[PDB]
Design an enzyme around this catalytic site. Sequence first.
Site, PDB file in Angstrom:
ATOM      1  CG  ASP A 159      19.553  25.873 -36.408  1.00 50.76           C
ATOM      2  OD1 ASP A 159      20.212  24.835 -36.129  1.00 50.76           O
ATOM      3  OD2 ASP A 159      20.105  26.863 -36.958  1.00 50.76           O
ATOM      4  N   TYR A 182      26.478  26.560 -32.587  1.00 51.81           N
ATOM      5  CA  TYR A 182      25.998  27.919 -32.345  1.00 51.81           C
ATOM      6  C   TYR A 182      25.402  28.099 -30.977  1.00 51.81           C
TER       7      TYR A 182
END
EC number: 1.4.3.21
Lengths: 705, 711
Positions: free
Chosen positions: A330, A415
């Site tokens: 990420d 997320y």
Amino acid sequence: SQLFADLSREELTAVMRFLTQRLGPGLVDAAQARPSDNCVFSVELQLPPKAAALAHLDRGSPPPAREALAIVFFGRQPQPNVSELVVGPLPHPSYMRDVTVERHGGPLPYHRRPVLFQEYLDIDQMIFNRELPQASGLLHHCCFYKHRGRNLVTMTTAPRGLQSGDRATWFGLYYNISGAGFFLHHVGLELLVNHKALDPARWTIQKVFYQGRYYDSLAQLEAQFEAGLVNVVLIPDNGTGGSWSLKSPVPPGPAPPLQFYPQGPRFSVQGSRVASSLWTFSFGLGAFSGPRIFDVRFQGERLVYEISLQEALAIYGGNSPAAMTTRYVDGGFGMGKYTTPLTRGVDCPYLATYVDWHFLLESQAPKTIRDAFCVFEQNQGLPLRRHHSDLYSHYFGGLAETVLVVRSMSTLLNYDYVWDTVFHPSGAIEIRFYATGYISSAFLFGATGKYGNQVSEHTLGTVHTHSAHFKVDLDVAGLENWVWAEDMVFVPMAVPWSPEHQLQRLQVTRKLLEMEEQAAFLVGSATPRYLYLASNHSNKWGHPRGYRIQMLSFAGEPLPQNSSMARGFSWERYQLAVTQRKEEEPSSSSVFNQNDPWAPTVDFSDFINNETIAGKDLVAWVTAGFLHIPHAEDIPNTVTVGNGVGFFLRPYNFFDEDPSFYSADSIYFRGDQDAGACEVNPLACLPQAAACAPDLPAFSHGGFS
Amino acid sequence: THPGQSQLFADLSREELTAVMRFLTQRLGPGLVDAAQARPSDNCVFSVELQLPPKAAALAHLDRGSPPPAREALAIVFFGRQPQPNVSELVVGPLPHPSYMRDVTVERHGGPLPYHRRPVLFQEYLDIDQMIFNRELPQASGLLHHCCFYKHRGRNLVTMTTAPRGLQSGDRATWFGLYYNISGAGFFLHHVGLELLVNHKALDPARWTIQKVFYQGRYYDSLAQLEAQFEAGLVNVVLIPDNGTGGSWSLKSPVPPGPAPPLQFYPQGPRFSVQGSRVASSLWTFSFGLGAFSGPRIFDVRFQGERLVYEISLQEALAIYGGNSPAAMTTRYVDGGFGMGKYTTPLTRGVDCPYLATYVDWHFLLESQAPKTIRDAFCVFEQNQGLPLRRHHSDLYSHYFGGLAETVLVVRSMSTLLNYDYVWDTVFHPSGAIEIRFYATGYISSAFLFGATGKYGNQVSEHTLGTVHTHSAHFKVDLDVAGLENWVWAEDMVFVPMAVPWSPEHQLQRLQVTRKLLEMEEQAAFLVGSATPRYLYLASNHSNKWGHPRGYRIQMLSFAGEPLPQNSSMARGFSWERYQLAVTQRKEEEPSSSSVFNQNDPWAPTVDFSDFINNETIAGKDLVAWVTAGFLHIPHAEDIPNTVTVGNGVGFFLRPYNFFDEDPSFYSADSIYFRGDQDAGACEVNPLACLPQAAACAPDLPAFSHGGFSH
Ligand SMILES: *[C@@H]1O[C@H](CO)[C@@H](O[C@@H]2O[C@H](CO)[C@@H](O[C@@H]3O[C@H](CO[C@@H]4O[C@H](CO)[C@@H](O)[C@H](O)[C@@H]4O)[C@@H](O)[C@H](O[C@H]4O[C@H](CO)[C@@H](O)[C@H](O)[C@@H]4O)[C@@H]3O)[C@H](O)[C@H]2NC(C)=O)[C@H](O)[C@H]1NC(C)=O
Ligand SMILES: *[C@@H]1O[C@H](CO)[C@@H](O[C@@H]2O[C@H](CO)[C@@H](O[C@@H]3O[C@H](CO)[C@@H](O)[C@H](O)[C@@H]3O)[C@H](O)[C@H]2NC(C)=O)[C@H](O)[C@H]1NC(C)=O
Ligand SMILES: *[C@@H]1O[C@H](CO)[C@@H](O[C@@H]2O[C@H](CO)[C@@H](O)[C@H](O)[C@H]2NC(C)=O)[C@H](O)[C@H]1NC(C)=O
Ligand SMILES: *[C@@H]1O[C@H](CO)[C@@H](O[C@@H]2O[C@H](CO)[C@@H](O)[C@H](O)[C@H]2NC(C)=O)[C@H](O)[C@H]1NC(C)=O
Ligand SMILES: O=c1cc(NC2CCCCC2)c(-c2nnc[nH]2)nn1-c1ccccc1
Ligand SMILES: O=c1cc(NC2CCCCC2)c(-c2nnc[nH]2)nn1-c1ccccc1
Ligand SMILES: *[C@@H]1O[C@H](CO)[C@@H](O)[C@H](O)[C@H]1NC(C)=O
Ligand SMILES: *[C@@H]1O[C@H](CO)[C@@H](O)[C@H](O)[C@H]1NC(C)=O
Ligand SMILES: *[C@H]1O[C@H](CO)[C@@H](O)[C@H](O)[C@H]1NC(C)=O
Ligand SMILES: *[C@H]1O[C@H](CO)[C@@H](O)[C@H](O)[C@H]1NC(C)=O
Ligand SMILES: *[C@H]1O[C@H](CO)[C@@H](O)[C@H](O)[C@H]1NC(C)=O
Ligand SMILES: [Ca+2]
Ligand SMILES: [Ca+2]
Ligand SMILES: [Ca+2]
Ligand SMILES: [Ca+2]
Ligand SMILES: [Cu+2]
Ligand SMILES: [Cu+2]
């Protein structure tokens, strides 16, 4: 000092006026840049080197130059590369310095570069305008296709291909749900898309997945359908109940508990430094690594040079391809880049201090992401400590734990990641991270139950792991630290006062870890119970001045090493690691590991390499994560409860006694005192504030893009 | 017709207790004595507390509106006035107006209770302290004038007791530390170096003995033989201070109050209610008690109307010690045989619970003949957690925020045993999850510092070895997941190496999920530091709206130490230690993990939790999970004065796994949401925008008022 402060807007602006005038024209606003262009992708603080800084903080020395670090995308040229360029000195910069070769040892292949917005933007036209209408037949009967398709939408995945050099990304298609989460409406269609070229025009579609099978192209498919060999099923584009919403139907109740600062707030925030009567430190956000603090000083004494987030990782299973490839690194997109505005009252106490964050990413001006961090004190409704004696003497003494907290949240696709550093008046430090927000969903065709749970209508909840990595540069009583491992054991002995009888003698065990490898522990193996970084020094009672790392992690179990990809995040492999700090080993992963983890731009197992960790400036590295098998109650969102992970940094004969003992908020009284009297204890002093109390600021919110 | 309202899990009231006492006095055939003065040879009402209803009957009442069951009470009675003196357990009901009394001792146990299993009375401790300070310590007056400031009587000095009293079944000899009594702070650190092995099996205290002595690092055969040595020169003696300053001495902060801690207040209404033993919120309803010995317990837990768990209840606490000295080196405390409820203490408002908590008293008849009352024993409150339960910010395609700050319902009691200050917690989340917590603060049992130290802890103040110990606690979790009949499931993960389906040249490590059904008691008995299924949960035959069984996941939160090795005869007394987790067929004869009577004869225990695990199915039954949770403690400087909480938050979660069809919190009133296109600063879009404009107004506070001390 304003030394670890992220770059001011003014600073960011003036690095740009440089880079532009001093890279010729023919440079583009990365906003609109095509691959074969030259553009500046990021300008962020280049953190000073440690020695030069301490010198300046501890011993007058003037301050190391304040410097940017620009990542530049060099498309427009025969050997296109990515280049890390140090710029400076700030505020009025004069020099610039390709450091790329120094760091990695050669240039940066251009296919490691992060996908630009404009790149996604182009990729969607290649689908929305040129590949999907090939199947406007099927899509009408499956999924409400209308000409030319502003009901559907895409989501990137993981690494982008199967071996190094590849730049081929699997996208899912989902309904473009209004005002709520799209991630739950996988239309059933996945697409591999080879966008390796510098000319978008030559981008292809290497593959296609539909309701369980794979077709080499989109016509290949729409055909196979029109031939009635493919069973369409109409997926509803509409619904009710959390699958489709976030707004609660149930209307507002009596408001929930509010905390307030009766006597005014007991901490301050100037610039990026935080100061309370227990802690000072400086905080910040790295465009990619994410949040970090430095120069953490507990009552004037420095405990850690740096705590910081290195990487965050997510590793899927699945029905589908796009899921079963997917491992996101990420940082590859950027925890800082994608820190979202904090919502006053929800993300943080209504009465926290909310601070802005500035950045120049894929642009030519800086922008601000308002209310990006919050800092607050929080009564925990819990004793830091307490004792109550009815035995032999009558007294009570304890103290309510209030805690100091700094937090930001990074929203990366489905997320929302919650990043907490919290500061206990026992001298301890907690790092917590929380996975909340939406899940990634597949579309569901039968062959399932190995890859997750039905959480919905058509919707598979796709199994994954999370993992996160932190840098902990503890300088326990200055740089030279060792590392110890205390644990425990039983020993059959005789009973001294009856040697015929046996007892099971409990003992401590200690052992010094001397070598980078003796202090690298894998997920799956046993950490020892007590494990800390010591100094040469001792406290008053003769005990190595020490700080302990106690880990809160549920073994987000790791992608096996046998995979070509794994060197992209070799830290997932380790519960915990310690190394020698080194300016050249400054990060655990890097923004570039995303698109080529087969050629790690940084591979962590390297850091661990037959060195001594006996009286060196050490740095420990902690991994934290869990297994996540989504379940119904993750709809609409995964909740925070139970999903906190990280570690505790705890004093261990570091002090001569619990420093809370010198606490201003300690409470104490004896059997024989008037507990109800204001100068036996101050709790009995209700008056405190004037008027009708907690004065409250008028609500506002950051905004959006 | 009737849901059944009765509160049959509420502990006894004063009246009720008095009633039972009255009943017993009369039916015991005088010779009966008040406990607070009983000799071993006497007869004695030790405990009287609530007797819990059998489960069938209870639910029958609560679920199918049947008539509720006989409210009863359990009497523990030491019969010392006889040839085979026994302890006996007596049921007495039916409250409020009792009219029957039955001896259940033999049914529960298979015979009578060996008399020495009984706990030690406040008398027995008194009688001991006399044998000590009045018939023994003077025989060493000299030494003690020198080392230890002694005179007539000792009076600056104080005892404390160890766990198993002896070395076999039958032994009742306790090792007794001796320490400087201290004005208004912990005597535990100021251990003078003397330790006495008193033998007090005899029911005639005249006949009590000292079988061994330990001064400062040597064993002498009797306090007399120690004067022999003392004055004859031959005993090198360390001088340890009476008095001092700071942490080892005081507890009073030497500092002025600063400005003010932050204060939590419910800016309109509170949002739950307590009514007797029963609490009720918008989401949650449950009854809460305190066993005398087992300690805190709640029952009949209901999330939005639906019962999740019948009972959750601390069963036992442990502390196993290492050391230099005979005290610390064999101290295996089994804290229930003193009693976690008995030693519960008052919560200090503004410290042990937020200021505006709801606090609640707790009545008891223990070592007495009139009930008495710990004031503010329990607290209940709604803690805002400062932290979203969930949120999502959307910058991408669609502009919206939706989120909700976790607020939480807590129920706390603290048992203070000797030095220990155990905080017990039970926490109720808006998600439908239930968190059990456990702390240890207070002071630490210490020894006089002498020799091999590092093998048994750290030095922590002058002359003071902070000895090494482990903690354990056991919990009973009787889930009854949408129904009594449950199975247990064990999901985890695995990677399968396969060829990429669309490019067979290459491999992938294929992530998969592994669901395995645990079918026999032993397959769900997991030992310490081990194989532990990442997702382990109990569930129903019945499935949710998407076909998955309806389940509750037990997520452990322990760091346990090496259990006492199983080769110790004493191990049986806390067999539960050797498990992280077990699941058994729930039974009326398997009501407690432990026993108040295990503590003083673990060599022949009253309960051996390993018995509950026998070749038996757990395929669709009443299922009770048993979580062991705890950790290792090597004391250090920052344990002075008190061990701090931060990071010793041990316990577990009960987490909803496909029990619902969505997250219940979707429906919360306290949820927040706005679209990009809106003004989130407007009060009608956002409840929070309305807090300044209106709610604000903190209440006047109740005058502080502690619930004081015992005797
Ligand atoms: C990755 O890719 C980047 C960008 O493509 C590279 O950056 C350049 O690389 C080349 C060498 O490979 C070098 O370019 C030099 O450019 C300079 C241009 O002039 C500057 O600006 C003004 C004039 O406009 C002057 O005032 C300054 O002094 C600068 O010099 C120039 O200095 C230099 O020299 C000359 O060399 C050749 C041969 O004679 C001629 O083509 C040219 O006209 C001139 O006479 C180079 O041309 C330099 O390293 C980089 N330039 C910049 C701006 O960064 C990286 O090197 C690549 N990385 C890797 C690993 O290859
Ligand atoms: C443990 O101790 C108790 C009390 O000492 C024992 O219970 C007592 O048992 C005796 C007889 O065993 C009972 O007394 C008898 O009553 C009958 C008829 O009522 C009469 O025929 C006898 O002459 C005598 O009076 C006595 O009531 C009973 N007491 C109580 C309180 O129950 C008990 O037997 C011991 N436990 C075990 C397991 O042995
Ligand atoms: C995806 O759908 C969203 C809404 O669900 C679209 O967003 C809005 O569309 C209106 C149409 O007039 C425009 O004003 C803006 O585009 C949006 N308005 C606001 C207030 O946010 C969006 O266009 C759709 N598709 C994509 C690919 O973005
Ligand atoms: C131990 O020291 C304490 C001092 O705190 C003694 O307690 C006091 O004793 C006097 C005389 O009995 C009482 O009147 C006071 O009320 C007590 N004060 C407190 C705060 O408890 C205690 O009695 C001393 N000795 C022993 C053996 O306990
Ligand atoms: O930030 C974006 C932005 C995307 N697209 C929009 C398209 C229109 C202008 C803004 C950029 C897109 C996008 N557009 N099509 C597929 N993805 N993705 N992401 C993203 C960010 C973090 C992690 C993963 C994706
Ligand atoms: O509650 C007590 C009371 C003790 N002594 C009492 C003090 C009150 C008056 C009678 C004698 C004593 C005691 N007295 N001398 C040695 N011990 N101990 N304990 C105790 C409690 C829990 C766990 C361990 C001990
Ligand atoms: C502790 O020992 C190391 C040995 O390498 C030494 O260099 C260091 O200076 C010592 N600490 C102090 C304060 O002198
Ligand atoms: C590690 O380095 C030392 C030199 O300090 C050497 O003796 C040892 O053999 C090395 N170990 C390995 C595995 O190379
Ligand atoms: C990885 O796993 C095992 C280890 O022996 C083996 O089957 C396989 O060949 C390994 N991979 C290789 C050699 O590429
Ligand atoms: C499950 O339990 C038993 C199987 O042993 C069976 O009789 C009962 O009907 C079952 N119920 C459901 C819903 O499957
Ligand atoms: C359990 O009993 C034994 C092993 O303990 C085994 O032979 C048997 O098959 C089991 N019995 C039943 C009824 O399930
Ligand atoms: Ca190294
Ligand atoms: Ca260091
Ligand atoms: Ca059984
Ligand atoms: Ca059950
Ligand atoms: Cu997840
Ligand atoms: Cu402890």
